[PDB]
Write an enzyme that holds these catalytic residues in place. Structure first.
Site, PDB file in Angstrom:
ATOM      1  N   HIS A  40       0.777  -1.273   0.184  1.00  0.00           N
ATOM      2  CA  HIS A  40       0.163  -0.044   0.040  1.00  0.00           C
ATOM      3  C   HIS A  40       0.774   1.327   0.069  1.00  0.00           C
ATOM      4  CE1 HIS A  40       0.060   0.108   4.293  1.00  0.00           C
ATOM      5  NE2 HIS A  40      -0.050   1.372   4.163  1.00  0.00           N
ATOM      6  N   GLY A 175       1.490   7.095   8.758  1.00  0.00           N
ATOM      7  CA  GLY A 175       2.724   7.455   8.497  1.00  0.00           C
ATOM      8  C   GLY A 175       3.866   6.588   8.774  1.00  0.00           C
TER       9      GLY A 175
HETATM   10  N1  ALG Z   1      -3.641   2.015  12.095  1.00  0.00           N
HETATM   11  C1  ALG Z   1      -2.743   1.599  12.780  1.00  0.00           C
HETATM   12  N2  ALG Z   1      -2.914   1.051  13.896  1.00  0.00           N
HETATM   13  N3  ALG Z   1      -1.460   1.423  12.144  1.00  0.00           N
HETATM   14  C2  ALG Z   1      -1.097   2.085  11.066  1.00  0.00           C
HETATM   15  C3  ALG Z   1      -1.693   1.558   9.847  1.00  0.00           C
HETATM   16  C4  ALG Z   1      -1.549   2.235   8.582  1.00  0.00           C
HETATM   17  C5  ALG Z   1      -2.507   3.536   8.787  1.00  0.00           C
HETATM   18  O1  ALG Z   1      -3.617   3.315   9.546  1.00  0.00           O
HETATM   19  O2  ALG Z   1      -2.613   4.495   7.790  1.00  0.00           O
END
Ligand code: ALG
Ligand code: CA
Length: 223
Positions: A40, A175
């Protein structure tokens, strides 16, 4: 990283920042010419930044090397995030030293309860927004597959695991994508997805790297 701590400059020598005019994702150096990240995080025009602590200041240990090619996993599905893994080859070999070093791939998968180090330059707030300049760290256990599946019904595949704290407060965040989860000196996870950050019963979900070692090795051997 929410609820973590300042790692210390160059204490996580395999941590890379992927830069396209700005930091947009983490990654892990696995040998002198290859980085592992999340699918991604795919985009063109990637510069790999090694030896970083403060990503906004040249501090003297950096190596900036452009990517020559990126390889998203053949079975990556962007809707489900199944197989969220990508390899990036560097145009030139990094000069490996104490502050720029590869991380070992696992020969064995990690079990629930094992403690790991998760790191990145992502958001440090669970509600608001604040991006750190220096690398942040979080020590977190791998959660059981059953608790992971219960947290995210219908969404956890055999290529994913949860790590963190069901009570919330401590998590990866926006990030941190593509960055490392290292357990006993082995890269076991890649920051993949979640539902917000550090929310109760919504721990981070990570790509299960041990499933991909064969693919990584054979890909490196022919590219
Ligand atoms: N959401 C969590 N727990 N971690 C980061 C994953 C990537 C994102 O949410 O943009
Ligand atoms: Ca820097």
């Amino acid at each position: 990283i929410v609820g973590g701590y300042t790692c210390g400059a160059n204490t996580v020598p395999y941590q890379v920042s992927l830069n396209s005019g700005y930091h947009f994702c983490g990654g892990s150096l696995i040998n002198s010419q290859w980085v592992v990240s999340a699918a991604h995080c795919y985009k063109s025009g990637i510069q790999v930044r090694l030896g970083e602590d403060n990503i906004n200041v040249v501090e003297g240990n950096e190596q900036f090397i452009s990517a020559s090619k990126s390889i998203v996993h053949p079975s990556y599905n962007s809707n489900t995030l199944n197989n969220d893994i990508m390899l990036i080859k560097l145009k030139s070999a990094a000069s490996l030293n104490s502050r720029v070093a590869s991380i070992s791939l696992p020969t064995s998968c990690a079990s629930a309860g094992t403690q790991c180090l998760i790191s990145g330059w992502g958001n440090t707030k669970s509600s608001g927004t604040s991006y750190p300049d220096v690398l942040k760290c979080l020590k977190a256990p791998i959660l059981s597959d059953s608790s992971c599946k219960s947290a995210y019904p219908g969404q956890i595949t055999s290529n994913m695991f949860c790590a963190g704290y069901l009570e919330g407060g401590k998590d990866s965040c926006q990030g941190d994508s593509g960055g490392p989860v290292v357990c006993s000196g082995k890269l076991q996870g890649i920051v993949s997805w979640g539902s917000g950050c550090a929310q109760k019963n919504k721990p981070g979900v990570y790509t299960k790297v041990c499933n991909y070692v064969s693919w990584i090795k054979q890909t490196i051997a022919s590219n």
